[PDB]
Structure formats: C-alpha cells, structure tokens
Design a protein around this ligand. Sequence first.
Ligand SMILES: CN1CCCN(C)C(=O)COc2cc(ccc2OC2CCOCC2)Nc2ncnc3[nH]cc(c23)C1
Ligand code: NA
Length: 333
Amino acid sequence: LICQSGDVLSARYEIVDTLGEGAFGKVVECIDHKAGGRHVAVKIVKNVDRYCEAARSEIQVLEHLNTTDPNSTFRCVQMLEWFEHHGHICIVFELLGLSTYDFIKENGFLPFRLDHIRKMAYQICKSVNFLHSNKLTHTDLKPENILFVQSDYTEAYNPKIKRDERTLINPDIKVVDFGSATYDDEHHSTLVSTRHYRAPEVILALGWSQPCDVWSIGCILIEYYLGFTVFPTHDSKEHLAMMERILGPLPKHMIQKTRKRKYFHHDRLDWDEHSSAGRYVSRACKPLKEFMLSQDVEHERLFDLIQKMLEYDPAKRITLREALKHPFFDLLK
Ligand SMILES: CN1CCCN(C)C(=O)COc2cc(ccc2OC2CCOCC2)Nc2ncnc3[nH]cc(c23)C1
Ligand code: NA
C-alpha cells in the first residue's frame, strides 16, 4: 500500500496525512466520513508473522477495556474500530497529538514544567491504575507511548535559547500501545519493556507483574523533569551500575536469588567504578536527589514519589492506587 494523501480505505476513511512510519507499517491520519468528518488515526500493520500478534493482542485488550469503560474515562487510548485490509490489519483510534517524547525532542530536549509534569503524572497513574484494576500490566510504558490529546500550542520567543518556543495549551494525555499488555493469567514473556524503562526484577529474571509498570513510570517522570533518559545503555550490567549510582545498592536478596550470575561477584555487582565505563557511569548518572533543580516543597514532593516508584523490590514498590494519593498531587484536588 502507498497511502498517498487522498487515498480511501473501506469507503469511509480518507487519508489526509501520514503521521509516522516504521518497519511494522504506518500510522495515518484519516477523515472518517461515516462518522460525520471526525479525524481518526489508523495504524496500518503488516499482517505477517513479525507484527501480527501484537496487533491482534492489542485489539483484544482494547475491546475489553472499551466494554468496561465505553466513554474512555481513564486516560487510555480509545480504539474505535478494526478491520482487515489487503494483507494488513488496520486499527482505528481517536486522533491524538504528538507523543510526550516527540514534544521534548521538537523542543531541543528541554524538560517539561513542573505544573505540567504534575498533571501528566496524575493522568498516567490514573490510566495505568485502571489497567492494574483489570488484571493487566502494560509492560512498555515510556514517553513515546504517552500522547498528548492535542498539539495546539502558544509560542513565545525565549531569549535564553534564542528562539521561539511552543507551550501546549492543554497537557492532557492518553496512554497508547497496548500490543504488549499482559493479563495476570496469561503467559509472561521473560523479557519485557523498552530497555531504558525496564524494572530490575525484569533484568534479573525474578518474575514481574503490575509493579514493573510503576518502575517504568518513575523512569518517565524523571525524564520529563530532566529532558534526557536516565539509563542510556544497552548493556544490562551497566544498566544495573547506573541504577546503583542513582538509587544505591540492589537489595541483597534480589542479587542472591537471580540466576543472572554473570552480573555479580560475591553478591555485589561485578563492576569497577574506576574503569572507563565506571567513570562514564559516574558522570552520566548521579544520586537521585542531586538531579533536583530546586529545593521548593513541590520539587521535594515529586522526588519523594519518584523515589517510591524506583524502589528496587517490587513487593515494596508503591502501588498506583497509593501513588494517586501522594502529596505531590494535592495541588490538583
Ligand atoms: C497508533 N498509535 C500507536 C502506534 C504505536 N506507536 C507507539 C508508534 O507507532 C509510535 O510512533 C507513532 C505513533 C503515532 C503516530 C505517529 C508515530 O510515528 C512517529 C511519529 C514521530 O516520529 C517518529 C515516528 N500514534 C498516534 N498518533 C496520533 N493519534 C493516535 N491515536 C492513537 C495512536 C496515535 C496510537
Ligand atoms: Na501538591
């Protein structure tokens, strides 16, 4: 399929733009003429072994969540319809704006303002708690999978970076991409999450469930506050070293129980802090509170919540039901 602007799918959907393209296929914006001209997003997924399972799985999850919550009141993306189409699976969603990643990137990796982080954090927690209440774990939370509802924006010239800068009119979000979401009673893949957002119990192959999402959210929130990913590595041992730099030592029981022995020596990470890699980690990462940009109470409150989300032991990690009551959110209520 070429999906030029102007092409039509299933009579009702007129393509107006391609929003993005990947190896899986593409995401297009369409006018849905059947529904009165509403614009929608259509994920057009190649119906081949490499991509089909995630498409079919997302469709099942979202059909369930749509039955449970037909008006989409918990900040989860609303799938409107799905269909078979000439060797592709097309999944039609409400149209959303750019991802939170996209926004930060287009703004030169400047971080979000704390007031917007508070609102976005609450909405992410509310959405994922809804999944947790329904025996689901998302497993792939990251900024790319949190989309702004609207991209409309105001623009001031910012003299400190010597250019115009956009501020969103509305920081409301939806959580997207339910292709990895897993029910409690379903097969759990050994490896889940995008590497930078992956919980320690996943890395150590200790078993995972809902708490691994809370770890990912902690990772997201600190990235919103700083503008950069806090664990920038593809190496598991280095990732654990970065964790230890930011958060202190791993709990001994987790190190003792893991079968991933290659990471450890005498039940400590097998890591030379003064090697070239160790020197890099020491400069790339710092103890969590040193990342704070202010000592204002509200910054302290955010960092308290982040620390609770980045608890190593998933049995001790804050739940999203508890997170929604955290004092950081008082200013919203
Ligand atoms: C269907 N959609 C989740 C699909 C899976 N997923 C997370 C991606 O494919 C990520 O990449 C894009 C998502 C996207 C639009 C464009 C994307 O392409 C990027 C753009 C930035 O430059 C890199 C390539 N989604 C959406 N946009 C607008 N409205 C939407 N409604 C629902 C979705 C969506 C979710
Ligand atoms: Na508050």
